[PDB]
Amino acid sequence: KDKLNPPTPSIYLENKRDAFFPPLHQFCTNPKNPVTVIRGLAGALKLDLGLFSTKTLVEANNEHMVEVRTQLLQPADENWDPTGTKKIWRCESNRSHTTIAKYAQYQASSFQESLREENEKRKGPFKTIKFGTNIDLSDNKKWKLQLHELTKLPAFARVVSAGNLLTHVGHTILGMNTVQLYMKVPGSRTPGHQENNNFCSVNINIGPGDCEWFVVPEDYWGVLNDFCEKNNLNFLMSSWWPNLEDLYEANVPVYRFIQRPGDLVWINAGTVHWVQAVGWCNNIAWNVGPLTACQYKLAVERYEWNKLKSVKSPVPMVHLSWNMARNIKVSDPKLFEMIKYCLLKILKQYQTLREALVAAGKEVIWHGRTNDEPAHYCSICEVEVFNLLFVTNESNTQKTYIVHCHDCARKTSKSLENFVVLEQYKMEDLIQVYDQFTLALSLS
């Protein structure tokens, strides 16, 4: 079917008015659009892309760390086994570190070399290439001008904004509410994935070359998960590059398009995607969490799925839910009922545990909280832990307060004789927040 190769939802901006036009915001967050390509974005806003050129970055922080992926240069949209025999899903992506200065040297000399090949005139085997990925631009003192340029974007797409759920977590989540940079040569691949906890993502191509994108809607993610399982791959943790013929045969639609310098790509909640550089270019990217029922629902789903798969959630959805009820007026009836439901579940499970502890003679110690103190995760199994913290007698004594979840502490110390129970929030306080959380009226 032509329905298996659908057109890409696109918007062409000419000027600042197109960029601040409110229906643009509604178009991007609409669940029917798995991806939106906003063409001409940097031009419309007069964004100085030159601030993210390799030359500028070398000048600013030449010793900054780069994660290198070493890959094979593959033809077009395919991925072949090393021998050139069959197309397969597993893709080779070996890891190391370098600096901005050293990758730049390779980026530049790579281009000079293809110029000379182009003037030499005249199934693999395939060449090897290096991709500079996940460069951390969180530091405002190292990247002042770079980060300031991005405040020129319309609010809904900014790293920081009042309507962005990630802004209400109350703490930095590296790569999500901070900017990441990518430095590329042709063939550089970002393999198939969903965003962390299914949050939306924003990507701007700095240029000068293009990137080619492949996109699959959220509700087909299960099919791709089955493919991975059948091919001995972990959907969440392995590197894989889908066989397009396998997908067409399984009746999975695939969006495909080119991102040019200055184009902004909006990846909607839960959308599955993978990317390769066609030319020489840099990209920047981060996440955004719109206040919609669909975004919250999908984030919670992946949060629960991550527990089953023994994978840590970078977004602490329990802490976030309480922050919302504490500080945000919610006027969408569906979204409100979702949050209220989750808080109720958290509260009941917490009340159930606290009473079992008390019935069994275990002391609960008032420990409280400092402000801007992150959510805590279990030092053993890395699940989020809320309110009741399990700390060893020794770690308590030394005031290191190393956190365990209840189950991990029990597996170590059968009657918890090796632990103290620390409580961060009074129950009366939590009941109050829940009870005062009501649906706000909006006429929109």
381 binds, among Mn ion, Zn ion, none (CB under 5 to 8 A by kind): Zn ion
Give the shortest CB-380-to-Zn ion separation in angstroms.
Answer: 5
End-to-end CA distance of the chain: give it in Å, rounded: 39
Q: Could you say whether residue 408 binds Zn ion (CB under 5 A)?
A: yes
The reply to whether 381 sits in an annotated binding site is yes
Residues 182-221 touching Mn ion, rule: CB under 5 A, are 201
Residue 228 is assigned to a ligand binding site = no
**Contact yes or no for 296/335 (Cβ under 8 A):** yes
Give min distance, CB of 267 to Mn ion, in A: 6
- Contacts of 406 by beta carbon, 8 Å cutoff, 6+ apart: 353, 388, 390
Rounded to whole angstroms, how far apart are CA atoms 227 and 61? Answer: 42
Which one of Mn ion, Zn ion, none is in contact with 88 (Cβ closer than 5 to 8 A by kind)? none
What sign for the dihedral angle of Cα 243, 75, 285, 205? negative
* Residue among 288 and 357 whose Cβ is closer to Zn ion: 357
405 in a labelled binding site: yes
Is residue 225 within 8 Å of 301, Cβ to Cβ?
no
**What does 38 interact with, of Zn ion, Mn ion, none (CB < 5 to 8 A by kind)?**
none
215 binds Zn ion (CB under 5 A): no
What are the backbone angles phi and psi of residue 245, rounded to the nearest 5°? -75, -35
* Helix segments in 250-363, DSSP class H: 293-308, 317-327, 333-359
The least CB distance from residue 273 to Mn ion, in Å, is 6
Binds Zn ion by CB under 5 A, chosen from 51, 328, 381, 416: 381
Single out the residue of 50, 76, 47 nearest to residue 263, CA to CA.
47
Q: How many CA atoms lie within 13 A of 304 on its CB side?
A: 6
CB of 192 to Mn ion, least distance (A): 10
Closest CB to Mn ion among residues 134, 413 = 134
Q: Write the CA distances from 278 to 133, 146, 352, 363, integer angstroms.
A: 16, 25, 56, 62
CA–CA separation, 231 and 192 (whole Å): 14
Give the nearest distance from C-beta 126 to Mn ion in angstroms.
24
Those residues whose C-beta lies under 8 Å from the C-beta of residue 443, and which sit 6 or more positions away, are none
Q: Is 311 in the site for Zn ion (CB under 5 A)?
A: no
In the complex with Zn ion, the residue whose CB is nearer, 195 or 384, is 384
49 touching Zn ion, by CB under 5 A: no
Q: How far is the CB of 279 from Mn ion (least distance, A)?
A: 20
Considering the rule CB under 5 A, would residue 409 count as an interface residue with Zn ion? no
Question: Binding segment for Zn ion among 185-193, 271-279, 311-319, 403-411 (CB under 5 A)?
Answer: 403-411
- Tokens encoding 413: 């110390």
- Binding-site residue ranges for Fe cation: 193, 195, 273
By the criterion CB under 5 A, which residues form the site for Zn ion?
378, 380-381, 405, 408
- Binding-site residue ranges for Zn(2+): 378, 381, 405, 408
By the criterion CB under 5 A, which residues form the site for Mn ion?
201
